[PDB]
């Protein structure tokens, strides 16, 4: 389970290779669900599966 800034869910996290732009906060897939998230505190990007 995870909870990121009020966003809750379950799944596994891995190093995502996307080129997130500075003004983008969170990525979301084709089914309007969060796919990749830009981590808080330290700035990294992780995917959800």
């Amino acid at each position: 389970n995870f909870n990121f800034n009020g966003l809750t869910g379950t799944g596994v996290l891995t190093e995502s290779n996307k080129k997130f732009l500075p003004f983008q906060q969170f990525g979301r897939d084709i089914a309007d669900t969060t796919d990749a998230v830009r981590d808080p505190q330290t700035l990294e990007i992780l995917d959800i599966t």
Binding site: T8, G9, A31, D32
Partner: protein
Amino acid sequence: IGKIQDSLSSTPSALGKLQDVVNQNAQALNTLVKQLSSNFGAISSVLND
């Protein structure tokens, strides 16, 4: 028997029946997947929130 091979090869519109079968199946599945995004008169389409 020699000519039939090149006759088949030249024309690109012979396998239309199988093509439409596959396309109809895929379109139905895609629409069913897409339908999940509706709010249906509710506040949001996400159950967790």
